Amino acid sequence: EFLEEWSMENLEEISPAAIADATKIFVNGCWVGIHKDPEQLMNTLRKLR
What we know:
With 49 residues, the chain is an alpha+beta fold. It has 1 helix and 2 strands; from the N terminus they run E-E-H. It has one helix at residues 38-48, and strands at 23-27, 30-35. It is globular and about 30 Å long. The two termini are 15 Å apart. 2% of the residues are buried. It is classed as transcription. The entry lists the keywords Inhibitor, elongation, active site, transcription. Structure of mammalian RNA polymerase II elongation complex inhibited by Alpha-amanitin. The protein is DNA-directed RNA polymerase II subunit RPB2.
């Protein structure tokens, strides 16, 4: 849930010509989206943990 309100583009609502310069987000094995700013997402997830 938290990833989807933190602006994670899903797999169905995206064009594959905008996936080269984006980070693959996995959760527990399955690929669930991409993201365009992985450091603010990363330390935000850490300070929520």
